[PDB]
Amino acid sequence: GAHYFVELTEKHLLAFEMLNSMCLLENYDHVLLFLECQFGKSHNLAVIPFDIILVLFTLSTLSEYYKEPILRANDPYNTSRETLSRRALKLLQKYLAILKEFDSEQYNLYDLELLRCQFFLAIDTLTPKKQFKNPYRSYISCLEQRNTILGNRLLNLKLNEPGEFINMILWTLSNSLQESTPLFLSSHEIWMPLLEILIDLFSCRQDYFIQHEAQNVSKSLFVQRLSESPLAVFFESLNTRNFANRFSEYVFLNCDYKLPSDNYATPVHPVYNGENTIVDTYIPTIKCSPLYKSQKSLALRRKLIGSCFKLLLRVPDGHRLITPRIVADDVIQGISRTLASFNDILQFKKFFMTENLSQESYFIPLLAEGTLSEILKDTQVILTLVENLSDGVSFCNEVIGLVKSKCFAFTEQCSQASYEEAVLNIEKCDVCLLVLLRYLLHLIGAKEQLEMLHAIEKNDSGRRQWAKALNLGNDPPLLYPIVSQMFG
């Protein structure tokens, strides 16, 4: 322990000891109130010790949907009209959004650094092992004599088991679209929120590890270290030689894709006993439409894919990493294959219809150009869209060629029998081109677009007529009206 460890002062030692003593008596209500009753005040930033961040991570897994009696027996009065899991998650999110904003115009330049060390002393105790280290010798933390928080064992104890960190990911990725009450719930109020927190911590611990290492080193050593990086030990849990096919099938685990591998993931078991069961007293009140579930699920999956691409585009043009055995050049093909070979148009939009068109860059246009260069291959070229994201003319001057080579226009090889599959394929291309064009304008702020515009509008005729050639009651999925508006 040499880097990122900051010693506390006499002001923070009393806070740490009082918090640990309050936790020792199982008085978690006051442990939450201590941190909550001083958040929006003067610049002090009462920081949580890591031995309490772990208790928070374990409390946050005590959702009221399956454990009502334990929560209701902990604190009968419930003055806040809330539950420990709902509160613990709020505090975690609050301190995490604080950690992601290291500004000196806020609480302190030392308490912030004392939080950054306290959140990094907590994710280090969670090592992705393939399917009590206390640095503060000033107080007796309440994790020496306690391995169970109201029934739930712990977070680092339950994830450091043989092949348990990967079941925690593959067990929340399949209940995020569930149409059942306990399953979806468990992956809505517990692991979906928690998994976005963790991924948010590894994605900055990796930044600490990368920005604070050995400046100016040889590629051989540089890339040899990248396999020892925080994130790299997180990707290891996948335990697969063939990343390209494993990862891609592990990311989308309940989508409607082609399913080419019958040997799918084993039926995943819940992390905690009773997680997949609803208690009789609790009655849910939210009506989550399937569109909402698909939106949340695809948001989490896109976050995982970005967290992947975080270290995979770090490896230089030299040798590939040795620890994860990731290629970083054809894993895009594997993911863009599962997107093109889909069967639902709603889920295909919600993946690319992202809310943060800037926070998740650098891999959506690479995944947008990867699906556009895979549907054409299997259904009627060397594209350069992703390379032309720095020239308004270039990308505009190459889109004509496609539409002019019967790219997005229907073929005559099929009939009116398989019109759907013939319509979906051109409907999937609509979604992919828009995204590529939407990024263009946004990343770039004459007749070039004019020419392209006309072409797109003149290509609609075929579809329109194609609606009459197959005697349709309505029209086909046009791609002119949606584009015209975009250009303003």
Binding site: C37, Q38, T79, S80, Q93, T285, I286, K287, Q295, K350
Partner: protein, 238 residues
């Protein structure tokens, strides 16, 4: 008491109609123009099952202590994204006041409070539209006495407007705070006294620490009282 909160939303939300409105918005947001379904903000509210054609808690009518009624609610982020289409920044004040009151009433009830996203984006973005002095001057229409059970809630949602919220309630100002501590201890209004404690503690008037002479009083007043003693001990040991 149990689930005795404000409960703005009285009936079930028009699921199918809302779902319909939920579509045509993802590509819209990623790429209001569609307002033919619900023309006005009153229509948008009643679509949420908000109210049988209602914006002020009638405490004489016991509106501040309702029942469960086991009613369903649409996702709160969708609610606050639909409600923020009828904003009309450049419009009259008699409609913007209705918009603000509708937002405040549908942020204080238990359903929207106990069913909220862990990270708040919409709640802070909506409040940022109005003025803090205007949000708290045209305050959440609760009486000043029972202003504290709902003020603790408003401070749980938005914690930055606490000093800017005791001024409008008490108008140094610590004499009023100490006098209002009485007539709560003089009466048996301990619950409202507890929430008054939880609302005022930590401000510029009643800071934390060992140092306010409330502890002595409580020690002399001695099942809802114990919690007061514990919270006071905790706040003194800070």
């Amino acid at each position: 008491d149990k689930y005795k909160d404000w409960h703005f939303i009285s009936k079930n939300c028009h699921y199918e109609q809302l779902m319909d409105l939920e579509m045509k918005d993802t590509a819209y947001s990623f790429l209001e123009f569609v307002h033919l379904k619900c023309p006005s903000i009153t229509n948008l509210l009643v679509l949420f099952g908000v109210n049988q054609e209602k914006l002020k808690i009638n405490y004489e009518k016991k509106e501040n202590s309702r029942y469960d009624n086991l009613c369903t609610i649409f996702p709160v982020n969708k609610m606050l994204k639909f409600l923020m289409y009828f904003y009309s920044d450049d419009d009259n004040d008699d409609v913007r006041e209705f918009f603000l009151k509708a937002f405040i009433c549908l942020i204080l009830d238990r359903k929207v409070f106990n069913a909220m996203e862990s990270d708040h984006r919409l709640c802070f973005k909506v409040l940022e539209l109005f003025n803090e002095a205007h949000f708290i001057n045209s305050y959440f229409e609760i009486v000043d006495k029972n202003d504290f059970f709902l003020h603790y809630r408003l401070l749980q949602i938005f914690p930055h407007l606490q000093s800017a919220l005791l001024r409008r309630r008490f108008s140094t100002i610590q004499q009023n705070i100490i006098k209002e501590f009485n007539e709560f201890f003089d009466c048996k209004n301990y619950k409202n006294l507890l929430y008054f404690i939880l609302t005022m503690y930590g401000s510029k008037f009643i800071p934390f620490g060992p140092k306010e002479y409330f502890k002595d009083c409580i020690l002399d007043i001695s099942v809802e009282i114990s919690i007061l003693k514990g919270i006071l001990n905790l706040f003194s040991k800070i």
